[PDB]
Design a binder for this molecule. Structure first.
Ligand SMILES: Cc1ncc(C[n+]2csc(CCOP(=O)(O)OP(=O)(O)O)c2C)c(N)n1
Ligand SMILES: Cc1ncc(C[n+]2csc(CCOP(=O)(O)OP(=O)(O)O)c2C)c(N)n1
Ligand SMILES: [Cl-]
Ligand SMILES: [Cl-]
Ligand SMILES: [K+]
Ligand SMILES: [K+]
Ligand SMILES: [K+]
Ligand SMILES: [K+]
Ligand SMILES: [Mn+2]
Ligand SMILES: [Mn+2]
Lengths: 370, 329, 329, 370
């Protein structure tokens, strides 16, 4: 009987390498088929109509906003934009399964989480425009959203950095003892960074109530997953860290919802991490949910038309007000570097003010506040 | 001035600082490699037994994780005191520090912050640490707006400065000169107290030349001042910089306006070292007062060597000879 | 002088440099995120089709891995040209660069080395890159003995400098000013050529003031010189530093001895920026020649902002106003 | 049928998290029992006597050297020392299975690899003393060995950095096409660093002929593995990267030998990575091999006595010559920073020479060359 502290195991008397099973991987959990039909009645969450309609309206409203801001980017009205196409169901379905005060870390494809938590169109827009309504003060590139009120930690561009941070926040929540989970979104690309390894391992050994939500769409920019990893996706990594793992159909809001609801329930009760890998495309979550609504009698062509019209108008009202707002005062380039402003930073602020008094005609001052 | 004191060496004054913080702040936790049993330099002895295994705990062996983890704790408002085992091993966490911690508040418009984070780390040469147990990384961090870098010269200084870091509302790196951990003890107040950040201390007044240093190197320049006075009749003002960024430009400039001469010394390599920032700034503010060129007596531009350490360090003879030349310019 | 040339913008001159290297060195490989299809800035277009998928290939998304991997290739003597996608994302690899690449040769007594490694990376501001698409990290690397840091101002300069990095027997970081990638073309020789490392270039001779900069900022100071001449009757010597470390101290000091005045400019933040190293060095060597304080016109000590970029950069008006004050001191 | 590029998998219609199996982990491969008896005759490598005696003599000679240098460290004659206790069989058994030109990366516990490749006692000693015979020029802490002639890449103190480097060297070897493997040693502690994740993944996706050799002794300094990870040791991670993996009894030189021989054979032929996790203690490899030798008639008490005596004398001859050598010229602090010496570095070298002319009486000059 083996006496090694590092591992709990029998002896074996024959040489045998462990082979990965990548050809038949962790199967993909699905609740509804491509026609919006429930496959297995015992798995139906039976979400009420009001809630299912809110999922549908959040996904479509996001998609409307994507269309417009993507065009805005194309004309150089905004400098950058990441869309949410194919990712609407992973984000709205997972968000619906959280408590509203569960803390969210993510990156570029998580606008749907905010949309579900009713973040105003005005504030999505203010950030992309860097205008005076932006609580981010116009400091970051577009789509770098954050909302303290809606427990959505500000996005930063370096990939995977939020993963070990999300673990620290989950640990602090555990100690604070008020029944909260953290969720942390990242793509399959970002899962290759050393920080993913750091976060997964810390969550397991420190026993943190965290959901890791990996969006696997098969691509990181131009890099197919065949160049990204050789195991069975991200889900097969979870068990090697001691993490409970599942793979789900990212086009199925109900599958995403079910897996997130159950991961949240068990993460908070047991203080242990859960890994969800949602398979998406770089057959669509919106049209699948649409088919489901129709079979229930809960949507029709007329409501679809009226909703496309109303959501286009809401987005265009926001878009135009966002474009017409001034940018923040250029003084705001100097605040919040530290909480207080160091005397030497204030001196740099004063030198800018002095500079703009002599040379101001050469700066775009008329677009900026004060 | 500060109530009851007892004799403490540098590591004990750190433990005292950390004890006082945990006692008064229910959110505070301490974590890193090997901190549970007391740490490899004994700075956390007794804290886990006293405060509980959920407040004083070991992490997996991963510096980028330790810092990322500390940032996430601080994001919720809780005090996170992270340890990195040697300053030489802070580099895996460099992206978490520079791109994340330092920018957390700015980039969010102050919606989020990790101000309640402090990273402590043993620092500086030790006689035989060679390449990876000797480093002074402070100049790497001085070029990153949004963090504070603080380095004490003694036990009394270390406890007061560490308490300020821990309570400061900005992410702080506190570098502890490991050669002083078991060196001479001094009297250190038992109860908490603070020493202000971004404030240099004139430890000895002088009229001919300003000497500036931080950490162990403060003791070297104190000795240099003593050699100058005795051998040369020269009166040195000795200044402990204490905070690397944001640094105390006024105290250094006011001293140089009085003396007209400056020598800056640090163990870190010359090129890109923090003495160049001090020198170029004092040159700008005290140009007309300068009697001689500002002199920098630093480690050589090489990695930190094992067997050649005695010949590498900016010791008192190196500093003294530069001071002598500067006085004769 | 150099044989047949054709018009190339900065990205095409990089491709030309990389093509010439692969053609003449059978061991050379190029690797990083998204390089196979040509790269996100088009610097590797056509190379994989021409040289094969085993020589021009994508890595997993992991900067510390890319650099570690490049070091191991170079350890065998093969040329490794690693790409980091934005200079802002070089920080995960900071420990691989600073503790490993820079020290590889020293610490082994030259038994092993990774001199055949070069890391290229887009660098500098771009109008709208904000915090993580704008950075100029060169001062972080200047404090690390054992690496070379090189930054071109143009297509002609970029190809000659990159070829020198790639062939140099030390690990090199080559920072490509991404705002110039698609900017104006110039004539660039088709066949390989070298521009020496650690050599500044006086691009315009002057008698009143020395201006020093690197990258895009060279074009800014050229314009400043033109404004000074026209508005002030002032004659500027304009110097492209080109290599950050080891830097060309002699050319800068010889110019300042002639002019008695120096203004250094760079996009990176003032504190800890590389201008402080140049300033403190010239102050030491040209103390007696200095008519006015060495002036540093740098980015502010903040993270790089999105909407406020126009007010952040050390533009020609910022530089000109400092020059004006310096001329009047 | 699922159409996702990221993973090859069926659908599943029921919610099921994948649970790690840590209680019954990857079993531990063993060839000989604690009495030096072969358990399964078909697994016996039947190494010839000359080779098995060389394994035994290398392990014991290492252990002799450890005893003496450990004492040297205790008296402050050397400043630092890492021993090899419990690790002699993992290192000598794996080294014996490599070709002599296979390139080795490791860290602190790999002296046995060098001992097996006949690295002179004089050179082990020269490095710990930083004397004139050190090819490392006295620049690194003791036990930071490197030998270009014996394809043993110089050790550096930062943990795990050599893992992605070893992958790059394996890739370059693949392209050079002359049938060479790289082996890369690291502890279970170092396997938590982001660089381990980097190296494992790059090896699999870039198809590198590398053996990852993880020594799992249950401790990283004071940290038990319960604080280091929660999966089934390091071996269970391999499959999640697409890497063929095995766990072996680190006290059994034959098990270590067999697994390394087979990993080398398949790594070089297939250009793919192999992970070996060798379980050790922080029942001993030397005494187990000793029992084996006796049962063969290949060793006895008299030879054991004579060998302890001879190896003690060889080590003491080396130790005393090492102590009596001068240290290298202090000029060597400046060379090899770059290949050539930059003009400004040479100026610093000259300033030191100038300094030592005036102040030399205050430096320990009499111990140093020239
Ligand atoms: C540390 C770092 N390296 C590189 C980048 C450049 N980059 C921005 S998105 C991206 C691909 C991310 O892929 P994945 O994580 O799969 O997310 P997806 O875009 O498919 O949703 C890259 C390489 C970055 N932002 N940060
Ligand atoms: C990057 C880094 N962090 C920390 C250390 C300090 N350190 C030296 S050995 C060690 C434990 C290593 O444990 P493991 O990898 O299990 O090897 P073992 O000592 O058990 O053989 C640590 C934390 C180091 N050298 N490098
Ligand atoms: Cl990006
Ligand atoms: Cl160590
Ligand atoms: K991020
Ligand atoms: K703090
Ligand atoms: K090179
Ligand atoms: K190492
Ligand atoms: Mn992706
Ligand atoms: Mn171990």
């Amino acid at each position: 009987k083996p006496q090694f502290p590092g591992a709990s195991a029998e002896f074996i008397d024959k040489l045998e390498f462990i082979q990965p099973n990548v050809i038949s991987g962790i199967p993909i959990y699905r609740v509804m088929d491509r026609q919006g039909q429930i496959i297995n009645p015992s798995e139906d969450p039976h979400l009420p109509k009001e809630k299912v309609l809110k999922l549908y309206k959040s996904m479509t409203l996001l998609n409307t906003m994507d269309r417009i801001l993507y065009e805005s980017q194309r004309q150089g009205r905004i400098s950058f934009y990441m869309t949410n196409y194919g990712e609407e169901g992973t984000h709205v379905g997972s968000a619906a399964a959280l408590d509203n005060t569960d803390l969210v870390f993510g990156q570029y494809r998580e606008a749907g989480v905010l949309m579900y938590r009713d973040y105003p169109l005005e504030l999505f827009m203010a950030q992309c425009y860097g205008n005076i309504s932006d609580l981010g003060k116009g400091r970051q590139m577009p789509v770098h959203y954050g909302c303290k009120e809606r427990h959505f930690v500000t996005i930063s561009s370096p990939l995977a950095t939020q993963i070990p941070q999300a673990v620290g926040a989950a640990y602090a929540a555990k100690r604070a003892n008020a029944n909260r989970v953290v969720i942390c979104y990242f793509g399959e690309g970002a899962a290759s960074e050393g920080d993913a390894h750091a976060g997964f391992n810390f969550a397991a050994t420190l026993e943190c109530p965290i959901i890791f939500f990996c969006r696997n769409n098969g691509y990181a920019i131009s890099t197919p997953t065949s160049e990204q990893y050789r195991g069975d996706g991200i889900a097969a990594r979870g068990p090697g860290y001691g993490i409970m793992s599942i793979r789900v159909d990212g086009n199925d809001v109900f599958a995403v919802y079910n897996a997130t609801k159950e991961a949240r329930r068990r993460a908070v009760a047991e203080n242990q991490p859960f890994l969800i890998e949602a398979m998406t495309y770089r057959d669509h979550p919106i049209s699948r949910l649409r088919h489901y609504l129709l079979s229930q009698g809960w949507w029709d062509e007329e409501q679809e038309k009226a909703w496309r019209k109303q959501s286009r108008r809401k987005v265009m009202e926001a878009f135009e007000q966002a474009e017409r707002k001034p940018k923040p005062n250029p003084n705001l380039l100097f605040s919040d570097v530290y909480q207080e402003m160091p005397a030497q930073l204030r001196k740099q602020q004063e030198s800018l003010a002095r500079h703009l008094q002599t040379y101001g005609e050469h700066y775009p001052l008329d677009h900026f506040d004060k | 001035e500060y109530g009851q004191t007892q004799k403490m060496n540098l590591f004990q004054s750190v433990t005292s600082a950390l004890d006082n913080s945990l006692a008064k702040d229910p959110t505070a936790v301490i974590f890193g490699e090997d901190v549970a049993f007391g740490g490899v330099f004994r700075c956390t002895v007794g804290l886990r037994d006293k405060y509980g295994k959920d407040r004083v705990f070991n992490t997996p062996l991963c510096e980028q994780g330790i810092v990322g983890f500390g940032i996430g704790i601080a994001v919720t408002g809780a005090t996170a005191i992270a340890e990195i085992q040697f300053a030489d091993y802070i580099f895996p966490a460099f992206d978490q520090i520079v791109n994340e911690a330092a920018k957390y508040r700015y980039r969010s418009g102050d919606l989020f912050n990790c101000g309640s984070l402090t990273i402590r780390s043993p620092w500086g040469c030790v006689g035989h640490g060679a390449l990876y147990h000797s480093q002074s990384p402070e100049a790497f961090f001085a070029h990153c707006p949004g963090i504070k870098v603080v380095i004490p010269r003694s036990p009394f200084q270390a406890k007061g400065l560490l308490l300020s870091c821990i309570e400061d509302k900005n992410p702080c790196i506190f570098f502890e000169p490991k050669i002083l951990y078991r060196a001479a003890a001094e009297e250190v107040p038992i109860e908490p107290y603070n020493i202000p950040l971004s404030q240099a201390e004139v430890i000895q007044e002088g009229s001919d030349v300003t000497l500036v240093a931080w950490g162990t190197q403060v003791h070297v320049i104190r000795e240099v001042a003593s050699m100058a006075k005795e051998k040369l009749g020269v009166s040195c003002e000795v200044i402990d910089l204490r905070t690397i960024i944001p640094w105390d430009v006024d105290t250094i400039c006011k001293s140089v306006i009085k003396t007209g001469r400056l020598l800056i010394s640090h163990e870190a390599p010359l090129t890109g070292g923090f003495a160049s920032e001090i020198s170029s700034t004092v040159q700008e503010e005290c140009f007309l007062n300068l009697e001689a060129p500002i002199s920098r007596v630093c480690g050589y531009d090489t990695p930190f060597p094992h067997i050649f350490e005695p010949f590498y360090i900016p010791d008192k003879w190196k500093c003294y000879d530069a001071l002598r030349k500067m006085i004769n310019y």
